[PDB]
Amino acid sequence: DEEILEKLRSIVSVGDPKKKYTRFEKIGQGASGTVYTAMDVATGQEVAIKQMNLQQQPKKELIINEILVMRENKNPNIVNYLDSYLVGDELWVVMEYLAGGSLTDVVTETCMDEGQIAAVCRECLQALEFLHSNQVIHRNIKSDNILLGMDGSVKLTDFGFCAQITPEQSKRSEMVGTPYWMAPEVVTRKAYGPKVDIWSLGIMAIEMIEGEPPYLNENPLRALYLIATNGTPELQNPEKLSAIFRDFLNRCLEMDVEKRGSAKELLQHQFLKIAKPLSSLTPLIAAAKEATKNN
Numbered sequence: 001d002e003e004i005l006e007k008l009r010s011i012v013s014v015g016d017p018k019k020k021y022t023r024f025e026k027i028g029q030g031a032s033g034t035v036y037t038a039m040d041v042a043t044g045q046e047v048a049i050k051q052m053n054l055q056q057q058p059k060k061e062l063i064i065n066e067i068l069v070m071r072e073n074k075n076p077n078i079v080n081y082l083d084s085y086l087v088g089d090e091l092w093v094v095m096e097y098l099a100g101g102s103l104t105d106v107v108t109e110t111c112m113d114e115g116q117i118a119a120v121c122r123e124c125l126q127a128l129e130f131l132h133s134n135q136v137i138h139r140n141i142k143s144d145n146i147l148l149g150m151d152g153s154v155k156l157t158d159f160g161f162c163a164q165i166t167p168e169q170s171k172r173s174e175m176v177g178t179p180y181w182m183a184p185e186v187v188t189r190k191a192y193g194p195k196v197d198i199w200s201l202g203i204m205a206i207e208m209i210e211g212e213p214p215y216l217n218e219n220p221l222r223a224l225y226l227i228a229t230n231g232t233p234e235l236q237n238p239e240k241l242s243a244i245f246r247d248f249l250n251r252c253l254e255m256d257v258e259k260r261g262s263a264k265e266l267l268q269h270q271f272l273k274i275a276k277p278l279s280s281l282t283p284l285i286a287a288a289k290e291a292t293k294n295n
């Protein structure tokens, strides 16, 4: 539709990004748009700005939903939305910049201890409880969508897959997410709710432990099957974890969705009490940065 397009233009302001932000520097290009860093002319605030041509973006309703969800669910543990500009046929989204980069670089290049893992999990749980209490299910939790402050702050990003639920319709059935991180009830097209994010967080904890989610050597289809039939995935070396960490994992990765913990009740688990200060993540950030210098 060109109706859905006009609906999108409708919620964005027509103005020049350069009027407020200067010093544009490209730090990457994704399937969606092009991503820059920049600076607030007046306050000196560092920002991340995505540049996106609508004429070539399929499924514009998703872009609309992503912008709308960001605007109305602002929170300490979510990369927060500053502004978006409409310039002719291109959309410019402006977000906080988190200089500590992505948790994926930390999980693939460093060894995290239990205190550091606990701190990250607590910060993610805080955003999930916030979202779940506002009827937003993220549906795409993974280290790739966790951004880090230079001070160790932990922030959830990418809401392009999120679903808003209501008492009229409180569950979903569609296979939405990234295969390795999808809860089994999602893989097998059952009615699911907010706790699919809890499962996905459990898989992110396995990233922090082992460097990868389960089945990453396999293809996504094969992984989907492996999740469907195996259920609670297996750790390469469970003996290396504390009793309380193992207990935390089991409760994130519980098959029974009613037994599986919610964000609120996992925020009380004893595993989180051994968390280190978030400042402890900065050496990890430095390591990840060094390890990924070449590429």
Ligand SMILES: CNc1ncc2cc(-c3ccc(-c4cccc(C)n4)cc3Cl)c(=O)n(C[C@H]3OC[C@H](N)CO3)c2n1
Pocket: 028, 035, 036, 048, 049, 050, 052, 063, 066, 067, 070, 079, 093, 094, 095, 096, 097, 098, 099, 100, 101, 102, 144, 145, 147, 157, 158
């Ligand atoms: C490396 N520090 C860092 N700090 C901060 C952001 C912030 C965003 C961001 C988030 C979300 C959106 C967004 C929000 C609503 C609608 C629409 C259409 N886009 C727009 C951007 Cl611009 C980013 O894309 N990246 C880069 C990315 O690279 C891929 C990785 N998986 C996540 O971070 C950031 N990177």
